[PDB]
Amino acid sequence: VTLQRNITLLNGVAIIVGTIIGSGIFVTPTGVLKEAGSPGLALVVWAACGVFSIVGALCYAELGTTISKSGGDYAYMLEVYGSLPAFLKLWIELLIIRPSSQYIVALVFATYLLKPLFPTCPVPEEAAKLVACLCVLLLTAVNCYSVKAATRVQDAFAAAKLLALALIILLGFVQIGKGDVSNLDPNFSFEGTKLDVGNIVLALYSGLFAYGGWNYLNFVTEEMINPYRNLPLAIIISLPIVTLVYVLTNLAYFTTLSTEQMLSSEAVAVDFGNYHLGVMSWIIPVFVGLSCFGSVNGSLFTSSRLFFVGSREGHLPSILSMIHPQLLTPVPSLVFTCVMTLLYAFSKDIFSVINFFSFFNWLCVALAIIGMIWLRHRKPELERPIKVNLALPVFFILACLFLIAVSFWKTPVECGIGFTIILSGLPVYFFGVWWKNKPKWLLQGIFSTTVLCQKLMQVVPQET
Amino acid sequence: KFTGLSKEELLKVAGSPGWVRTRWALLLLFWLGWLGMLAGAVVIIVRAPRCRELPAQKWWHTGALYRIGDLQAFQGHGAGNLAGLKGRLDYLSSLKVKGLVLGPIHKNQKDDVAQTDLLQIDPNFGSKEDFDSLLQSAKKKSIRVILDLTPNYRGENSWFSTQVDTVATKVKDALEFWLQAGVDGFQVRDIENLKDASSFLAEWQNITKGFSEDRLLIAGTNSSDLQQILSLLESNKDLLLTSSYLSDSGSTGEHTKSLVTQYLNATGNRWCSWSLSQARLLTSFLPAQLLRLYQLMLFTLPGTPVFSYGDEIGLDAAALPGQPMEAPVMLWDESSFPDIPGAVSANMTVKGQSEDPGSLLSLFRRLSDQRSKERSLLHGDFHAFSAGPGLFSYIRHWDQNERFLVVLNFGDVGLSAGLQASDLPASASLPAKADLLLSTQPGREEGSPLELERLKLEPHEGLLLRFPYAA
Ligand SMILES: CCCCCCCCCCCCCCCCCC(=O)OC[C@H](COP(=O)(O)O)OC(=O)CCCCCCCCCCCCCCCCC
Ligand SMILES: CC(C)CCC[C@H](C)[C@H]1CC[C@H]2[C@H]3CC=C4C[C@@H](OC(=O)CCC(=O)O)CC[C@@]4(C)[C@@H]3CC[C@@]12C
Ligand SMILES: CC(C)CCC[C@H](C)[C@H]1CC[C@H]2[C@H]3CC=C4C[C@@H](OC(=O)CCC(=O)O)CC[C@@]4(C)[C@@H]3CC[C@@]12C
Ligand SMILES: *[C@@H]1O[C@H](CO)[C@@H](O[C@@H]2O[C@H](CO)[C@@H](O)[C@H](O)[C@H]2NC(C)=O)[C@H](O)[C@H]1NC(C)=O
Ligand SMILES: *[C@@H]1O[C@H](CO)[C@@H](O[C@@H]2O[C@H](CO)[C@@H](O)[C@H](O)[C@H]2NC(C)=O)[C@H](O)[C@H]1NC(C)=O
Ligand SMILES: *[C@@H]1O[C@H](CO)[C@@H](O[C@@H]2O[C@H](CO)[C@@H](O)[C@H](O)[C@H]2NC(C)=O)[C@H](O)[C@H]1NC(C)=O
Ligand SMILES: *[C@@H]1O[C@H](CO)[C@@H](O[C@@H]2O[C@H](CO)[C@@H](O)[C@H](O)[C@H]2NC(C)=O)[C@H](O)[C@H]1NC(C)=O
Ligand SMILES: N[C@@]1(C(=O)O)CCc2ccc(OCc3cccc4ccccc34)cc2C1
Numbered sequence A: 001v002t003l004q005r006n007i008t009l010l011n012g013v014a015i016i017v018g019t020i021i022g023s024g025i026f027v028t029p030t031g032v033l034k035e036a037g038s039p040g041l042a043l044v045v046w047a048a049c050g051v052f053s054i055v056g057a058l059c060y061a062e063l064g065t066t067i068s069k070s071g072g073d074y075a076y077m078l079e080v081y082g083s084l085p086a087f088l089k090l091w092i093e094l095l096i097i098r099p100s101s102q103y104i105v106a107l108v109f110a111t112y113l114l115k116p117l118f119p120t121c122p123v124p125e126e127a128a129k130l131v132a133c134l135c136v137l138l139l140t141a142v143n144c145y146s147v148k149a150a151t152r153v154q155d156a157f158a159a160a161k162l163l164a165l166a167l168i169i170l171l172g173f174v175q176i177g178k179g180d181v182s183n184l185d186p187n188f189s190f191e192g193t194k195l196d197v198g199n200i201v202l203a204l205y206s207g208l209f210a211y212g213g214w215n216y217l218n219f220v221t222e223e224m225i226n227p228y229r230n231l232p233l234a235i236i237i238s239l240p241i242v243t244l245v246y247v248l249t250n251l252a253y254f255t256t257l258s259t260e261q262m263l264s265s266e267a268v269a270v271d272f273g274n275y276h277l278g279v280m281s282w283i284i285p286v287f288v289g290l291s292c293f294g295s296v297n298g299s300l301f302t303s304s305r306l307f308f309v310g311s312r313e314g315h316l317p318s319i320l321s322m323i324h325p326q327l328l329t330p331v332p333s334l335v336f337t338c339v340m341t342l343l344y345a346f347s348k349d350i351f352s353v354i355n356f357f358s359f360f361n362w363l364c365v366a367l368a369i370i371g372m373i374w375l376r377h378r379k380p381e382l383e384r385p386i387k388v389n390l391a392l393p394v395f396f397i398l399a400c401l402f403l404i405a406v407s408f409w410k411t412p413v414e415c416g417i418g419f420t421i422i423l424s425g426l427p428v429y430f431f432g433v434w435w436k437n438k439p440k441w442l443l444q445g446i447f448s449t450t451v452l453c454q455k456l457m458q459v460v461p462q463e464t
Numbered sequence B: 001k002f003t004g005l006s007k008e009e010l011l012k013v014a015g016s017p018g019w020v021r022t023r024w025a026l027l028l029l030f031w032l033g034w035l036g037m038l039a040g041a042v043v044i045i046v047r048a049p050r051c052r053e054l055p056a057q058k059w060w061h062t063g064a065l066y067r068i069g070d071l072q073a074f075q076g077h078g079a080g081n082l083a084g085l086k087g088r089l090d091y092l093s094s095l096k097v098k099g100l101v102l103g104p105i106h107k108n109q110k111d112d113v114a115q116t117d118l119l120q121i122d123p124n125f126g127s128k129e130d131f132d133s134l135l136q137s138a139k140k141k142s143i144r145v146i147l148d149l150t151p152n153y154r155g156e157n158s159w160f161s162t163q164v165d166t167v168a169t170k171v172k173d174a175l176e177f178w179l180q181a182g183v184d185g186f187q188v189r190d191i192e193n194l195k196d197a198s199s200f201l202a203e204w205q206n207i208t209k210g211f212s213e214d215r216l217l218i219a220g221t222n223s224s225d226l227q228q229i230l231s232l233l234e235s236n237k238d239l240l241l242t243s244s245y246l247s248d249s250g251s252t253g254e255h256t257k258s259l260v261t262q263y264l265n266a267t268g269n270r271w272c273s274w275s276l277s278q279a280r281l282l283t284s285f286l287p288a289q290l291l292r293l294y295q296l297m298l299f300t301l302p303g304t305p306v307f308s309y310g311d312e313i314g315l316d317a318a319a320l321p322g323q324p325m326e327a328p329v330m331l332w333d334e335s336s337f338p339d340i341p342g343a344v345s346a347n348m349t350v351k352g353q354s355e356d357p358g359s360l361l362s363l364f365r366r367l368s369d370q371r372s373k374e375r376s377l378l379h380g381d382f383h384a385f386s387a388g389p390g391l392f393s394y395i396r397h398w399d400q401n402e403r404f405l406v407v408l409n410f411g412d413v414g415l416s417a418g419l420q421a422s423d424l425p426a427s428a429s430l431p432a433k434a435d436l437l438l439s440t441q442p443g444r445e446e447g448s449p450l451e452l453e454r455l456k457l458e459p460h461e462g463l464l465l466r467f468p469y470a471a
Helices: A009-020 A029-036 A039-066 A075-081 A084-113 A125-145 A147-176 A201-209 A227-254 A259-263 A268-276 A283-312 A331-346 A354-378 A392-407 A412-422 A425-429 A440-457 B007-013 B019-045 B084-092 B129-140 B165-181 B198-211 B226-232 B253-267 B291-298 B360-371
Strands: B065-068 B117-121 B146-148 B185-188 B216-220 B240-242 B272-274 B303-308 B381-385 B391-397 B403-409 B462-467
Touching (some): A009 A227, A009 A283, A029 A039, A039 A201, A039 A354, A075 A084, A084 A125, A084 A283, A084 A331, A084 A354, A125 A147, A125 A331, A147 A268, A147 A283, A201 A354, A268 A283, A331 A440, A440 B019, B084 B129, B129 B165, B185 B198, B240 B272, B253 B272, B253 B381, B253 B391, B291 B403, B291 B462
Parallel strands (some): B146 B185
Antiparallel strands (some): B403 B462
């Protein structure tokens, strides 16, 4: 009884494209224009985040073909740095990182799908919270049903969001095809470029939010048909498509609206639909919701597979990583993902957790790529189907260390709170993992609740 | 495996009847809970009240107009042509004005009626081509151009006292000519000297609207009587009218409050224009200690504020030696006023006041962007209410956006506010703690919330508190 590989090349392309293109292309440009000052600085920030994500994806393709086991970015750290940093990464990546990232996109889905009923108006908040929870519950039920159904969902919604962005891009092209330019003058487009790199790296963070999810096919390997070919071929095909669409969508945004027209706007896609369309301008918020639906589906998929792999190393309870026969899906891991995602619906503002934890999110990537170089030098007895040129990982490590050291130099009050939450897992590691020889007051109860959840969900252990 | 059972044990234990019924019951219970959450979202969505529909504003609803009567005195000598006016459009874009009432640039010799022509440009301003370039240059800066078509602007009687018909006949062709040229509106001043006045403005308004619905017509009187204004506003309602209705008085605040509220009552809460005159500065009617209070008042009343050139720096005509009061020299820099060198100062000029945060130009710029951006100041609702003996307090509120509260002290003693609201609608009732956005006088720090119970005001102070939609 195993997980029964189904992911094709086009399924992996759809997974990466649908998970990356979520909400950030419709929310973040105001935050980038606020910190860049000039539109040209915004476009070079978007292109820089694009090239940065492409370089990191090449390094993760080389890592995922080297080690080639599931649960990427956590198994790669467990292979090199032992058990305790892997558990700390798994702890943080569970608790704060995965349900908040899913709940943000679900909330943007619910907010933008209810915009035609409240055109010039704030949406009622609890209706949006309920619709977001409905989205999460429907998608986890679809994921608990079958894997082929979930890949069909991801395929359809990735194609839908691609055609939506193509429509927006061609509208921005026919606007500049009407012989005059609002923005994009060769001397005006750079007027307003502020400075103070400390006020530039915040625009870099706001752009790097929209590129999140670029390493999720590394989480969902061990289920790909022929991974040694179809993982880097999926990454190479997928991520250059995102950067081009992002810079063309920002360019189409700028030739409809002026600068402080966008700096004081609430939904720059809704205003774009209001300009180029009369009635039938609800198409654009409908399509934004359809993008965020597929992004939530892909993130739920990869999170369930990550907790599946983390249970197999003895770092999580063993009720997880139990497969249900005749469906062959990790049902308790999916239930555990959905429960946490619904649990983060009690916060009023959850966007202020991104700056609390960005330093750890890039520290783990930098640690994994340092471990990749150290593994290539220390242990050269592995088969490597792709081998990147060096000084791409070295430049990526230098850029990640630049982002970490700058985030400890402009806003050091949130990183301290983040580092305080990180070491709270250190009591948890020494209860369950390291502390064996537990009393019989605890082992029988854990066995009883495990077999009770087994009898409820009809799940067997893995082994095949 | 490690803390659980295996395949066969579970398949022969958890296959018994009851357990199958338990998991099917939990499945249908899950789907009924999902449908219950869907119904709970739907009945919350339909219970939300609705949201109001926007009034489809014009371009002159979204900011202030700027009157430049004498083009020679705006730039200065040697550059008083139409071409030099193109160089000031970046300064005019810093004031965020939406329109521009250029003075009468047509060829008028003197009180002879046969020689003047409203179709031709006077050669001391330029020609038609540098006017067409000016229109296209202002069109790129999002600034509209209104042309004053008052015929006899060099003379005492402004409408050619001899007869009335032919001088009103040439205006009819001038409207169609200059609308084809591409102007955005017209202005006619001194219509109290026009015989059969109310039945000519309707015809000119008809032609101006029949070209397009985005065309303006402004009329100007020197009247202060309310009934003479309403008589001109009987058959016309989309006509903008500038008068001397507020230039009368206002030593006390209850006079200005009654003057605003009686006009809004007798008109019917229609769209109006707020000014102090038709071609005069603010310093021609107010002392220098009331120039901030009236600038705070005119930017927050429900209408279009109209200003003359130099009202943002407090350009006083009587505060200098020999000079006409109809065309003072605009003080761009310190070297503006050429003769008597050493009469201007640093706080009297544009560039000297363009750096000081506690200046008058800074107050004008801080009001003129709030007027053109905030939704409850563009087409919001107005409500005045009773206050302390000498105050003027009112509230602007549109639907669910940020509510604005303005408090003004038109007197020379320190007053406590005492905002006994007691008559506002329940939608826009007062909160307990309102914020602060600006103040006319220095000695307040901006951004921290006060509370409107022990609210104390020093003389000639004005407050622009704000508070959000709540319950
Ligand atoms: C929730 C609905 C989902 C449906 C399926 C149920 C799945 C339940 C998953 C529960 C996951 C929550 C625990 C997260 C993992 C931490 C536990 C672990 O790593 O142990 C491996 C260890 C593996 O055991 P094995 O299965 O025998 O290999 O797990 C345990 O021994 C049992 C741990 C129970 C954890 C309950 C929550 C405890 C939170 C921490 C409380 C404080 C403890 C430290 C005391 C000092 C504090 C100052
Ligand atoms: C663009 C379309 C797909 C609309 C997407 C939203 C749909 C309204 C929802 C409601 C039910 C959902 C799914 C419910 C279960 C499956 C059945 C599945 O077909 C199978 O049974 C394959 C499983 C197998 O062969 O074993 C294909 C469609 C799918 C994904 C459905 C697609 C449509 C979903 C995502
Ligand atoms: C906090 C935890 C302990 C609660 C977990 C409870 C589960 C969320 C519930 C919801 C619906 C339940 C079950 C409803 C139907 C069954 C039977 C089975 O579905 C089938 O029809 C298998 C036969 C087939 O191949 O068609 C697999 C999924 C399962 C166990 C479901 C798994 C999840 C259950 C136990
Ligand atoms: C112009 O305004 C008049 C009343 O102010 C309206 O009716 C016009 O009256 C004039 C005589 O003064 C006629 O010459 C026009 O033919 C009338 N217009 C018609 C019948 O449409 C009318 O509201 C305005 N004109 C238009 C065209 O809207
Ligand atoms: C508007 O200005 C005129 C000119 O100063 C004021 O006086 C009128 O002058 C004309 C001729 O110049 C006379 O025919 C009128 O009879 C004068 N008006 C009166 C009331 O006698 C006129 O008073 C001013 N309007 C107001 C309201 O003050
Ligand atoms: C001024 O507004 C008030 C209400 O705010 C109205 O005054 C009413 O006028 C009618 C007839 O003129 C009287 O029958 C009512 O008793 C008045 N009510 C009040 C409360 O004063 C009216 O809209 C305006 N006043 C006038 C004279 O038009
Ligand atoms: C520009 O500043 C000077 C000095 O700061 C002002 O001169 C003051 O004028 C007030 C009233 O006019 C007097 O009470 C002060 O005693 C004067 N101070 C000095 C040092 O002379 C001048 O009035 C300011 N100009 C304007 C237009 O406000
Ligand atoms: N491209 C996306 C879009 O919706 O546009 C879709 C997917 C996706 C996945 C992961 C992600 O990471 C976010 C994140 C990073 C570091 C720390 C965090 C702490 C708390 C919460 C989130 C953190 C961002 C995005 C944005």
